Amino acid sequence: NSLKYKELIAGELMRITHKLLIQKLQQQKKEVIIKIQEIAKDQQLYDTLSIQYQVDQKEQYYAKIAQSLEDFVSISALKMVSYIYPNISYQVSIGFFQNILDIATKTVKDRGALGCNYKYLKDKLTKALNLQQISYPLISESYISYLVHLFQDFNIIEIENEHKFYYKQA
Ligand SMILES: [Mg+2]
């Protein structure tokens, strides 16, 4: 029930949904529908849910996914269209995720030659979505790295290989 754990779950779900959304668009008519069984096929999601819950059985794994996805419904990123297992599936709002891409693009573009880092972009996305009706952020660090890497694969962003390190003061 911690706010940090909710964010970590929601961020894996954000990536998965965006990944499915982009796959479906390429292979195709107007709407994109994803099954809960397709959302479930991600190792990090399973590993993240396995931190606090027993999700070795599918139904229990699916239950906990449906629970975390209720917040996605209330912010209009998804809409449930089939309710009765084995047919639990959702329509993805293409505007919601395109808006995420518009905001990410503008944030990094306005920085120009100074550029920015992963925290900055995360705070900026979150401030600009302004989803105060949930009470934890949906944007995790792992979702931001997936976006940054996606942008790099489309030649939009160049990632620096330099890192800072510090002497540990005894
Ligand atoms: Mg993620």
Describe the structure.
This protein has 170 residues and is mainly α. The protein has two domains: 3-93, Arc Repressor Mutant, subunit A (Orthogonal Bundle); 95-152. The protein contains seven helices and three strands. The chain has helices spanning 3-27, 36-39, 43-50, 58-74, 94-111, 118-129, 141-153; strands spanning 33-35, 78-84, 87-92. A three-stranded antiparallel beta sheet has the order 1-3-2. Helix 5 packs across helix 6 (118-129). It is globular and about 50 Å long. It binds magnesium ion. Residues 11-12, 15, 140, 142-143, 146 line the site of magnesium ion. The PDB classes it as dna binding protein.
What's the SSE blueprint?
Layout: H1 3-27, E1 33-35, H2 36-39, H3 43-50, H4 58-74, E2 78-84, E3 87-92, H5 94-111, H6 118-129, H7 141-153
Antiparallel strand pairs: 1-3, 2-3
PDB class: dna binding protein
Keywords: Tetrahymena, DNA binding protein
Assembly: monomeric
**SS-based class:** mainly alpha
Question: Would you give the CATH topology of the largest domain?
Answer: Arc Repressor Mutant, subunit A
Overall shape: globular
Distance between the termini: 36 Å
Counting H and I runs of at least 4 residues, what is the number of helices? 7
Side by side, the strands of the main sheet go 1-3-2
| DSSP strand count | 3
